[PDB]
Amino acid sequence: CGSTSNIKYTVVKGDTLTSIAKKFKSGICNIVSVNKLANPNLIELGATLIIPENCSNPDNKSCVSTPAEPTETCVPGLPGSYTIVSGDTLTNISQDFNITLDSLIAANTQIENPDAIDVGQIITVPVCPSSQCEAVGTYNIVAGDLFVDLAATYHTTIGQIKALNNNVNPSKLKVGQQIILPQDCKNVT
Amino acid sequence: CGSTSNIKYTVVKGDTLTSIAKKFKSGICNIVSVNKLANPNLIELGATLIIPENCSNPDNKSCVSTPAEPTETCVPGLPGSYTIVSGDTLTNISQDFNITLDSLIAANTQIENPDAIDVGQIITVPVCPSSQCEAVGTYNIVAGDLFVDLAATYHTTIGQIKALNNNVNPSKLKVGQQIILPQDCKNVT
Ligand SMILES: CC(=O)N[C@@H]1[C@@H](O)[C@H](O[C@@H]2O[C@H](CO)[C@@H](O[C@@H]3O[C@H](CO)[C@@H](O[C@@H]4O[C@H](CO)[C@@H](O)[C@H](O)[C@H]4NC(C)=O)[C@H](O)[C@H]3NC(C)=O)[C@H](O)[C@H]2NC(C)=O)[C@@H](CO)O[C@@H]1O
Ligand SMILES: CC(=O)N[C@@H]1[C@@H](O)[C@H](O[C@@H]2O[C@H](CO)[C@@H](O[C@@H]3O[C@H](CO)[C@@H](O[C@@H]4O[C@H](CO)[C@@H](O)[C@H](O)[C@H]4NC(C)=O)[C@H](O)[C@H]3NC(C)=O)[C@H](O)[C@H]2NC(C)=O)[C@@H](CO)O[C@@H]1O
Ligand SMILES: *[C@@H]1O[C@H](CO)[C@@H](O[C@@H]2O[C@H](CO)[C@@H](O)[C@H](O)[C@H]2NC(C)=O)[C@H](O)[C@H]1NC(C)=O
Ligand SMILES: *[C@@H]1O[C@H](CO)[C@@H](O[C@@H]2O[C@H](CO)[C@@H](O)[C@H](O)[C@H]2NC(C)=O)[C@H](O)[C@H]1NC(C)=O
Ligand SMILES: *[C@@H]1O[C@H](CO)[C@@H](O)[C@H](O)[C@H]1NC(C)=O
Ligand SMILES: *[C@@H]1O[C@H](CO)[C@@H](O)[C@H](O)[C@H]1NC(C)=O
Question: Impact of altering residue 89 to R (chains A, B)?
Answer without folding.
Answer: Impairs the binding of chitohexaose
